[PDB]
Design a protein around this ligand. Structure first.
Ligand SMILES: NC(=O)C1=CN([C@@H]2O[C@H](COP(=O)(O)OP(=O)(O)OC[C@H]3O[C@@H](n4cnc5c(N)ncnc54)[C@H](OP(=O)(O)O)[C@@H]3O)[C@@H](O)[C@H]2O)C=CC1
Ligand SMILES: Nc1nc(N)c2c(Sc3ccccc3)cccc2n1
Length: 192
């Protein structure tokens, strides 16, 4: 696949954009997880699949029995990896672009984390869309976190919900989803 448009998908707590704590997510939002699954799995084309790219640490955080993520091509990046097709569902690579040369029959490509991956790859011009779940809590500074996005949001434009809906197609998009003390909304951003 030559120069595909790639999207980052992440859930972050406002206003600091915290995303993790000691290798884990700082919340368990059941509905958000199902949205993640639907968005990264759904395709429009016939014999296609989407690809999900992640850093080695994120991969290793999934219990062995639950990896690869089903129904998507999984790509794992490590600076130590050779560019290798493991099986039909798993690819090893040392760079995003290199990994994409190994794929065919992919519709969309999503970067799913983690922090190092996100913070590096946001500056790669292949990245054209950000799908950010914006989480809010009454006392954000009560939720322990050690990992944050460092995204140059002044160079991006948040689109109206209508553009998000068009991006996700079928997927039901509820507003102001509340779970425990957290309230969240899905957003789409594109480059200025
Ligand atoms: N809130 C959310 O939506 C999400 C949050 N997260 C959170 O992120 C945190 C984990 O992030 P982090 O620890 O940074 O791990 P990552 O998943 O980002 O993995 C980092 C590893 O990826 C490899 N890597 C990183 N950058 C590159 C690059 N540019 N090219 C090639 N290989 C690269 C390296 O592997 P090697 O060392 O082998 O070279 C590096 O050690 C956790 O707290 C997790 O919960 C994760 C996903 C979503
Ligand atoms: N919006 C969004 N973005 C992601 N990247 C998510 C991920 S990615 C992940 C995959 C395996 C292990 C840890 C995180 C997991 C759960 C919910 C997620 N929500």
């Amino acid at each position: 696949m030559l120069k595909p448009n790639v999207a980052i998908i992440v859930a972050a707590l406002k206003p600091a954009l915290g995303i993790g704590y000691k290798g884990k997510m700082p919340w368990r939002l059941r509905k958000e997880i199902r949205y993640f699954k639907d968005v990264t799995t759904r395709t429009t084309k016939p014999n296609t699949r989407n690809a999900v790219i992640m850093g080695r640490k994120t991969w290793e955080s999934i219990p062995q029995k639950f990896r690869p993520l089903p129904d998507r091509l999984n790509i794992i990046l490590s600076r130590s990896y050779e560019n290798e097709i493991i099986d039909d569902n798993i690819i090893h690579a040392s760079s995003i672009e290199s990994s994409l040369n190994l794929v065919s029959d992919v519709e969309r490509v999503f970067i799913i984390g983690g922090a190092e991956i996100y913070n590096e790859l946001i500056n790669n011009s292949l990245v054209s869309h950000l799908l950010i779940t914006e989480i809010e809590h009454p006392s954000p500074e009560s939720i322990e976190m050690d990992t944050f996005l460092k995204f140059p949001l002044e160079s991006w434009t948040k689109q109206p919900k209508s553009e998000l809906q068009k991006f996700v197609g079928d997927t039901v998009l509820e507003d102001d989803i509340k779970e425990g003390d957290f309230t969240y909304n899905y957003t789409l951003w594109t480059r200025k």
